[PDB]
Design a protein around this ligand. Structure first.
Ligand SMILES: CC(C)(COP(=O)(O)OP(=O)(O)OC[C@H]1O[C@@H](n2cnc3c(N)ncnc32)[C@H](O)[C@@H]1OP(=O)(O)O)[C@@H](O)C(=O)NCCC(=O)NCCS
Ligand SMILES: CC(C)(COP(=O)(O)OP(=O)(O)OC[C@H]1O[C@@H](n2cnc3c(N)ncnc32)[C@H](O)[C@@H]1OP(=O)(O)O)[C@@H](O)C(=O)NCCC(=O)NCCS
Ligand SMILES: CC(C)(COP(=O)(O)OP(=O)(O)OC[C@H]1O[C@@H](n2cnc3c(N)ncnc32)[C@H](O)[C@@H]1OP(=O)(O)O)[C@@H](O)C(=O)NCCC(=O)NCCS
Lengths: 126, 125, 126
């Protein structure tokens, strides 16, 4: 009744590097929201920036129970940050609409990385 | 509120080593009867075993006891709902124990990358 | 009841070794609480001990939304264990007070390790 779903994702930087090589310059544009893409050039570690967002979006998609499908899409799931640096989700309008319809009230996020591994942790509440 | 949380990471190489030590009987000791029905057809059997092992260890940590008593590999079953979300199903001894503790719902998420399988579990009371 | 925040951390044992090597015992003196620092000489696996505490404290600081800041400090975030071995937090008095001011009622902890990777997950409620 409290938790709608939980999600975790572990993403290797190597995996992101291979995807970015395979799909070329267009890859970032397929995984990132327009806001994320606008701020990507200022990332200190671009590969890590993509990997974190990739992991966060997959973990989100698990926490809401559907996987990447329909409105639960890379382009609709954006990661932003509050004034203290805490990561938080911001949604394309098709996804905020879907979330309200599912009764999902809020979705929390945490991320970490170490060496070649990025980790995301998501909890969706009712 | 939350009763507890649990997490576990499992090496695919480790599961391989455990298979060699105990033979195919290892799977018979980690998996439930229902899991054992589809296990012979599993396309990636090391990954299949690793996921179940990690999930069951995480479950055991999330209920605060570890693998002990009714909290045992053979009582902790993983299934999936219609959309592919993993979810737990319990043997009778474990389902009773959980309810005795007031634990109402246990949620599960799994991920894997290269050699690492990761499970995270939240038990709610 | 609701979630205040969630936190995760992954920590490499090799990174801990590097940190011990550069700073010597001053690293443990910076990360451990006075209580933990007294029992550290008895840890059967001092690198694994420091790694778990480091990951748990970092995940804690994320779960309360601040990072390491103010009273949310390494020296105020302690790890103990209950009778069955379940890990749990204890707090320096200033942090206990802050948690109470914030309405945080319970912070849950889980840890795991495999090979070089130590992992911590934390959920702060209310
Ligand atoms: C779930 C998803 C986000 C990721 O799948 P993945 O990263 O390949 O798989 P992971 O190893 O991280 O985790 C898989 C686990 O997800 C979990 N999962 C699957 N479907 C799920 C769902 N609907 N809800 C919650 N969890 C789910 C399962 O536990 C699965 O492991 P199991 O089946 O062995 O239990 C999926 O929705 C997807 O579409 N992946 C492809 C993403 C993609 O498009 N990449 C290309 C970039 S353009
Ligand atoms: C605790 C257990 C669940 C996991 O053992 P493990 O995998 O070695 O433990 P992990 O390394 O995953 O995580 C260790 C952490 O578990 C946590 N933990 C221990 N007991 C716990 C408990 N009762 N409740 C919650 N968390 C617990 C602790 O934080 C511990 O690390 P710390 O003591 O350093 O803080 C154990 O009971 C277990 O089941 N081991 C293997 C089971 C087995 O039989 N394997 C052979 C195949 S038959
Ligand atoms: C938050 C903190 C713990 C980050 O730890 P880290 O190991 O540097 O970085 P990790 O990769 O583990 O985690 C980084 C993520 O923490 C998260 N984070 C940052 N500020 C946060 C906050 N206020 N609340 C919650 N999460 C936060 C972000 O998601 C960040 O990644 P992003 O910016 O790419 O989104 C760190 O910034 C901090 O606040 N204090 C550490 C200072 C310190 O003492 N270092 C060691 C000295 S021995």
């Amino acid at each position: 009744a409290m938790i709608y779903g939980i999600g975790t994702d572990i993403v290797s930087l190597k995996r992101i590097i291979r995807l970015n090589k395979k799909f070329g310059q267009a890859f970032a544009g397929r995984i990132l929201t327009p806001e994320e893409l606008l701020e990507f050039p200022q990332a200190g570690k671009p590969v890590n920036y993509l990997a974190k967002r990739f992991a966060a979006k997959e973990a989100f998609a698990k926490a809401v129970g559907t996987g990447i499908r329909g409105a639960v899409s890379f382009r609709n799931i954006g990661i932003g940050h509050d004034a203290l640096g805490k990561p938080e989700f911001f949604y394309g309008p098709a996804l905020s609409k879907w979330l309200e319809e599912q009764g999902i009230s809020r979705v929390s996020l945490s991320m970490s990385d170490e060496e070649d591994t990025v980790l995301a942790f998501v909890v969706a509440e009712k």
